A paper describes a structure:
Cyclic nucleotide-gated (CNG) channels transduce chemical signals into electrical signals in sensory receptors and neurons. Here, we report structures of the cGMP-activated human cone photoreceptor CNGA3/CNGB3 channel in closed, intermediate, pre-open and open states in detergent or lipid nanodisc, all with fully bound cGMP. In eukaryotic CNG channels, the main activation gate is located in the central cavity and is formed by two hydrophobic amino acids in S6 (the cavity gate).
In this study, we first set out to solve the open-state structure of full-length A3/B3 in GDN in the presence of a saturating concentration (2–4 mM) of cGMP. All three structures show a heteromeric tetramer consisting of three A3 and one B3. The structure of GDN_cGMP_closed is virtually identical to that of apo A3/B3 in GDN (GDN_apo), as exemplified by A3L, with a root-mean-square deviation (r.m.s.d.) of 0.49 Å, indicating that GDN_cGMP_closed is indeed closed and has not undergone any of the gating-related conformational rearrangements. The other gate residue F392 of A3L has two projections (sideway projection and pore projection) with a similar occupancy in all three states. In contrast, F392 of A3D and A3R and F434 of B3 have only pore projection.
Residue numbers in the entry:
A (entry chain A), C (entry chain B): 159 to 610
B (entry chain D): 206 to 646
D (entry chain C): 158 to 611
């Protein structure tokens, strides 16, 4: 058995081993700095440290079983996985974090749990869990805000523990800056100990500063160092939230810049008010219906195989209903749906009138068109989603009475999303299929004998 | 010493710039401290004098034995000879600032006494500090850590200058006169640095100013502290927005592709294949496409980056062995990079053949068994298959057998139309290619 | 009657339903936590709650009879509108917003308006009104600072009500952190209560913290949570205002970047000072006359039908004054004005000199040119708006004594805006028009035998 | 009749000379209206400066009623049409409202209330025009953005200082702990103490620091909460403007550093050899250090075709006229050929063209020192310098030539060069309008081949 690192079992393992790392950091620094809850609940921290050590042994023997991509394929040799695990420094950090340092409890009396600070070396696993969760989830900005709240909570708790350890080293209640005298039964409770030291670090690290002032030089130096660390950390968090917000509204900024540039251009060139109202309603439709991206730019970087699968998974059921593309080759149909290009029409906009130059084959997708008459609007046939027109104008049969003059008056009923297939893209895709090109020519010739 | 220092791939020059940076930072730090604070007492003056002699000896050694010997580029070619290097340093603008920095105003120690205000010309050698900072930004792997380090260093220097000016204001208003000034209880520089931090970070909790000079000082110091805190926040914002830009651009384009596929209701197998391609592309290249990077590079570096990757691999192909090297260079420039998922058919049996594939970082398998699943040969990285399809036209040759990808194979695809559009320039190589097509077909 | 969401009537209803939702949020948390507004103005809040419920059932009926978009057409059958409204979670949120929880007033004696907290669930109408106003209005940055001040004033008001509720739970006047004893006639007034709670929450959330320090564990924990919330609020405010300032001066930043890049190129290639100040004065004109963006880049994001309609509505009314294009066909006119190119000429620049190859045909739109005589200030004919030149040399009619050479020197008096119609552009627009190409050629042969 | 050009230097000097007293009127009219000891003590100075401001205001009306405006690209010089175009403008209504003679009421109140002179503040658009023209005129745009931000928040902080002193004068002096102290004490009653302590109060309020005494009254509480919301908005726009200044400062360096990081990621991907890796890195560091890092086809893309052609003339025409085959050709052909010239840069050690290569390019040397060497390595024959050229023969394609469009030389770049490349296809695309010059170029190349080898 070899666990795939890109699978779901490995991510569930990342959660089940990134819980005791956060446990080890948070509760080991409070157990080492307070010594009031370590002396109260010894069995609970013994059971939780035994479970964290069992999870760390399982972490070593699972991290020694994860595969890695060597030349595109997942390697499965366990000796190669064990040697690739041995040659890197994360095995050194794991074997340094899995030293049995708990045998020193027999010498110290188990009242000093700061000997378990070797177990804080597995922080790359927790950072890997945070990176994999913000990769996997669909709310990356909300997970980044939650991760920044968790980072400032870790830093607040570690600073509160550091302030209580410094207050224990100096002496409780001897000064005005330190934590007060714990022989008084009000300040001697563990709850007010932790919550007031958390309040002091909340006031200090966020650069508010309404604590009692330092009266000695060690307290002055610690408050200067602590204000400097707090202003650098909280300027980093405010810059991170600012960069995240400026990345969140960047698409709205770019779309509003495009709308304002087009509106300033049409205010400069004196375009009429009905056409301006039409194009502003078109951009409002384009924004409110979330079609602001375009196919030609969102399918730019993808390869032709995945673009072919995306194109045949939408267009092939409509192109196989087309009469002239009924019995052609599957690679020709893949290239034909690759050559399709989308066009969006407003309601009331004419697709083509009588006598215009016909060189595009329109394929209707999520829209409704109709062939109107010359003067008035009467509905001869209403073409629905999955219908098509424009095959004669792109076949251009020699000996035709049409003369590349696609017939009728086609206008849009609603907001249509037409996929056009031009003459140049058809003759570009039809170079490598000569007998299929000849079959298209005789199919158009039979259409010509049907249309006299 | 060598006759010429390269100053780009030389670590000894970076060590010397670190030494002159330590000298200049010693001047800019310990000149206001000795100017304001009473640490320059009559039994400690010899230590400051030995440090000042070592500092001026470092400055004079830099002006006399190192800065003439820097290599430079005039007219395109690198200059080597020491006479022209010395004349380039002498007619430079760094020599004017150096010779204005090393004016011996310490001769006036005999007239006016030991005063560190006369050494204020030594802080004009900031070009060595900026050159060392630019060299360390260019020689470090990740620049955001050094931008945070430089911002922290400028913040600590501004707070040190503010502590010195606050101790000067305390000496000007008298020590312990009002409640605003420094009182004299503990360490002078430590409590003045505490006042400078709590003022110029705009925190508060200090004693209020009493008279007009103290209120003007507190107003100007709090306004400068507001602007320093704003510059620190904007600097960290610019550093984070420059660091995460490629990751945010890749995530925005992947979100655009996922939103388009969910707008068109594309099913979960094709969506999983698109997300798998985007995940492996981010894990492999750390960028979407390389053609939009390479199309902004100039033609000679495009030529060299094409040659050192693929020129030997195309030179092992027996088809283009007799053609021209410039035609081979043009098909080096017009190669297209694709990444094929595992289990994907690159050339189905019976399908039209129009491409020549070069496999790099991957393994493909030719499925030519009786049932259609028995592998014949595993073409590893650096192989070239499908080279015979570049000469037939129209229908021509069909693909003989199914070939699938074993793992994440990054094929290099050359089309037939791009080969013909290259071949409209080279008629003799086109004649060689069509006569090779006639003798092989 | 079926309303459509893009109309003005739906936006007027969005205003009329975004009034009582904001009322419900603000004054329901105020009346829930203060207990003197509900005691004093009982009939006023009963009338306003009844009017909010009348607007809520009218909003339920409007969202029951609102239109959506399928196949580009506005859906008009109210049974399908009712099914599409009832199948989603907004109908569940409206029904949960209209549970009769006001029948507990006869149970508790009406002094508890906290049972109307289900009325806050209709927040999508307020967010939709904010998004539609940001789409509609022409001051997006001023509306964004108005939305930001309204959001942080809602949070400041909610935090003031939470602080007064916590002080009412703990006790009035028992500590230094809590609100004082309300039996004193100075601290007992409702205006003093609300404005001091607002001042407390502004000092807390606006990271200034001058409030007297906490005494007990609940007060310490609430101040820790409240200061961390204020740190996140300050980060959000700084990020939105910084991204808005970047969006406000991004156009000036990119034009300054292009100006300094062209200036760096001009001092890199060592151009003459007269050409450098000509480029500098042209960029000063291009910024002072708001012609910054380039029109071929502006007209790229639009579709082909709106591009052809805008190209007609700008260029065709000046193109039809050209006498060689009097009787051409409409599609030739459409692709002719689509393949036009506008340029702006500085004063003193020669458009075409005598003896140069005539490859472009220029028509004047909002300009004044003059035909000078051989590098002199003397002008023969001063051209004006609506005129043309360059039709003699573009067609290459056989029998030409000129031979494709512009025969006159033309200087620009002021800033002109010509339309550079190229020979290659006219030839590419004349591919699908062979009979109109021969008609243009015989018209040019007739006018060539007329003039020369 | 004299007409001042609005895009000239005299109009900008007038913008400075009229943006001084508007800014004076803002500062000292709100300070004289609120403090009431400046107006009592410096009466002669304020009457003289207000008379000078009114003289500058009527001269501003006389200048803005004579400045021109662009129609049809032409600067109109007809003063009657200029007066009509100014008369149909709302800025004329703002100016005639700004020059209402309120000195009758100002002497009726005893030359002691300058609150009546708040009509003079209506020329804010003139000061905004001055700041716009200075931020597009000066050479320090980021430093002027910082100075304009400092000046705007100084205007707001001074107005808040005047508002706080007016609120303290309305409520009472020393009746609370929040207000300004009792002015009967001669230390707290000095005018400098008044202005400096009120300015310090409004700075501590509007920058959200808070060392002020806490308010007592409800109106004081409401003014402090409104002033703290305005102050957190002011701190937000200060941090936003300084962050935008830093980003606009180092945007080009960050874009180049992201380009170098992308090139390093590509070279770590494709396993490029380390000698070529450090060659590309040293090449791009040279291109950044001598400020040519942006491609000139992307630099000159925003320029129109006439200015692009004139820049191409003024750079490349005096170098293209020195070429032997383009010595006697037409001016329009030379303008098209200097428009069609593309630049390429090289690094040391690279080959321009080798022996037996298909010659399709004509290289013109600029800022470089090439050398023609043999096949075995560095054996220099003739060091080629700046201004020279090669490849003018093999792109002409003379029929019957014994070389057959080859190179017959190995040309290396000793230092970094900046060559100019003229392709064969670009020469044929520029020679399609001059067939007589095409046959003349074939005749000159046939002459060169006849004197060399045939
Ligand atoms: N003329 C015509 N075209 C129709 C009709 N019904 C569907 N169509 C399609 O409508 C078309 C629009 O123009 P085309 O020239 O492409 O070809 C025509 C047909 O394919 C009909 O009744 N008449
Ligand atoms: N069928 C086949 N092709 C091979 C083998 N080894 C290398 N190749 C190449 O693999 C190919 C894949 O594409 P082609 O079908 O055109 O042509 C085939 C050969 O050129 C092999 O053992 N069998
Ligand atoms: N040759 C010539 N052209 C004139 C005259 N008056 C106006 N024009 C226009 O000036 C022109 C310059 O360009 P064209 O050769 O294209 O065509 C010419 C005419 O349209 C005139 O007297 N002679
Ligand atoms: N063959 C040759 N070319 C030279 C010499 N000196 C300068 N050049 C130029 O170097 C060239 C390089 O190749 P070209 O084919 O363009 O033409 C040649 C000449 O223009 C020389 O001594 N021999
Ligand atoms: C704390 O209080 C106890 C008794 O209240 C006292 O004995 C002890 O000295 C105090 N601690 C200090 C540091 O003063
Ligand atoms: C508030 O005041 C009243 C009367 O003045 C008193 O009875 C009450 O005890 C006071 N509250 C507290 C908490 O002391
Ligand atoms: C101000 O001081 C004077 C004398 O010092 C005193 O008479 C007067 O009442 C004081 N006014 C106030 C408002 O305190």
């Amino acid at each position: 058995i070899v666990v795939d690192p890109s699978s779901n079992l490995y991510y569930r393992w990342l959660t089940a081993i990134a819980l005791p790392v956060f446990y080890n950091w948070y509760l080991l620094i409070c157990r080492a700095c307070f010594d009031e809850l370590q002396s109260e609940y010894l069995m609970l921290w013994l059971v939780l440290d035994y479970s964290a050590d069992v999870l760390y042994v399982l972490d070593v023997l699972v991290r020694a079983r994860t595969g890695f991509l060597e030349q595109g394929l997942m390697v499965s040799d366990t000796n190669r996985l064990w040697q690739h695990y041995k040659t890197t420094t994360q095995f050194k950090l794991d074997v340094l974090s899995l030293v049995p340092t708990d045998l020193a409890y027999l010498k110290v009396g188990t009242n000093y749990p700061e000997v378990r600070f070797n177990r804080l070396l597995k922080f790359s696993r927790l950072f890997e869990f945070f990176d994999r969760t913000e990769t996997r989830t669909n709310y990356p900005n909300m997970f980044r805000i939650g991760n920044l709240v968790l980072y400032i909570l870790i830093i607040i708790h570690w600073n509160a523990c550091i302030y209580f350890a410094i207050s224990k080293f100096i002496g409780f209640g001897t000064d005005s800056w330190v934590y007060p005298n714990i022989s008084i039964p009000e300040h001697g409770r563990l709850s007010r100990k932790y919550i007031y030291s958390l309040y002091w670090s909340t006031l200090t690290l966020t650069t508010i500063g309404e604590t009692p002032p330092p009266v000695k030089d060690e307290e002055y130096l610690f408050v200067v160092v602590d204000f400097l660390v707090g202003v650098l950390i909280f300027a980093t968090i405010v810059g991170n939230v600012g960069s995240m917000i400026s990345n969140m509204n960047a698409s709205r900024a770019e779309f509003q810049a495009k709308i304002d540039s087009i509106k300033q251009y049409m205010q400069f060139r004196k375009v009429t008010k009905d056409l301006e109202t039409r194009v502003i309603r078109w951009f409002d439709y384009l924004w409110a219906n979330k079609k602001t991206v375009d196919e030609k730019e969102v399918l730019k970087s993808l390869p032709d195989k995945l673009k072919a699968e995306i194109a045949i998974n939408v267009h092939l059921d409509t192109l196989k209903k087309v009469r002239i593309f009924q019995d052609c080759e599957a690679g020709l149909l893949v290239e034909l749906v690759l050559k399709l290009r989308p066009t969006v029409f407003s309601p009331g906009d004419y697709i083509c009138k009588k006598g215009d130059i016909g060189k595009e084959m329109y394929i209707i997708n999520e829209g409704k068109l109709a062939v109107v008459a010359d003067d008035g609007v009467t509905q001869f046939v209403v073409l629905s989603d999955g219908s098509y027109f424009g095959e004669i104008s792109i076949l251009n049969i020699k000996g035709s009475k049409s003369g590349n003059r696609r017939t009728a008056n086609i206008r849009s009923i609603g907001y249509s999303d037409l996929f056009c297939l031009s003459k140049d893209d058809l003759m570009e895709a039809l170079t490598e299929y000569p007998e299929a090109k000849k079959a298209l020519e005789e199919k158009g010739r039979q259409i010509l004998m049907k249309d006299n | 010493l060598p006759n010429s220092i390269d100053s780009y791939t030389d670590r000894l020059y970076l060590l010397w710039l670190l030494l002159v940076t330590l000298a200049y930072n010693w001047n800019c730090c310990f000149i206001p401290l000795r100017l304001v604070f009473p640490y320059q007492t009559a039994d400690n003056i010899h230590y400051w004098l030995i440090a000042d002699i070592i500092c001026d000896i470092i400055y004079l050694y830099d002006m006399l034995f190192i800065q003439p010997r820097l290599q430079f580029v005039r007219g395109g070619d690198i200059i080597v000879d020491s006479n022209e290097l010395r004349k380039h340093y002498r007619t430079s603008t760094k020599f004017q600032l150096d010779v204005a920095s090393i004016i011996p105003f310490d001769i006036c120690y005999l007239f006016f006494g030991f005063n560190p205000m006369f050494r204020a010309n030594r802080m004009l050698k900031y070009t060595s500090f900026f050159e060392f900072n630019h060299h360390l930004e260019s020689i470090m792997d990740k620049a955001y850590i050094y931008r945070v380090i430089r911002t922290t260093g400028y913040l600590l220097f501004i707070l040190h200058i503010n502590a010195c000016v606050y101790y000067w204001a305390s000496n000007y208003e008298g020590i312990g006169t009002t409640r605003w000034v420094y009182d004299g209880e503990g360490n002078e520089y430590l409590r003045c640095y505490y006042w400078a931090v709590r003022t110029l970070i705009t925190i508060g909790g200090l004693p209020e100013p009493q008279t007009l000079f103290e209120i003007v000082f507190q107003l100007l110091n709090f306004f400068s502290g507001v602007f320093v805190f704003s510059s620190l926040i904007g600097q960290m914002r610019d550093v984070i927005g420059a660091a995460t830009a490629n990751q945010n651009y890749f995530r925005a384009c992947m979100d655009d592709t996922i939103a388009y596929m969910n707008n068109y209701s594309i099913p979960k197998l094709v969506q999983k294949r698109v997300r798998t391609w985007y995940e492996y592309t981010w894990d492999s290249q750390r960028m979407l496409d390389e053609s939009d990077l390479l199309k902004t590079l100039p033609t000679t570096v495009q030529l060299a980056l094409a040659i050192d990757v693929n020129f030997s691999i195309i030179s092992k192909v027996d088809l283009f062995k007799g053609c021209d090297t410039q035609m081979i260079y043009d098909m080096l420039l017009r190669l297209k990079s694709v990444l094929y998922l595992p289990g994907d058919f690159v050339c189905k049996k019976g399908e039209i053949g129009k491409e020549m594939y070069i496999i790099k970082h991957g393994e493909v398998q030719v499925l030519g068994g009786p049932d259609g699943t028995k592998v014949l040969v595993t073409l590893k990285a650096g192989s070239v298959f499908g080279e015979i399809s570049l000469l037939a036209a129209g229908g021509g040759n069909r693909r003989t057998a199914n070939v699938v990808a074993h793992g994440f194979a990054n094929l290099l695809t050359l089309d037939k139309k791009t080969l013909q559009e290259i071949l409209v320039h080279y008629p003799d190589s086109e004649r060689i290619l069509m006569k090779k097509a006639r003798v092989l077909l």
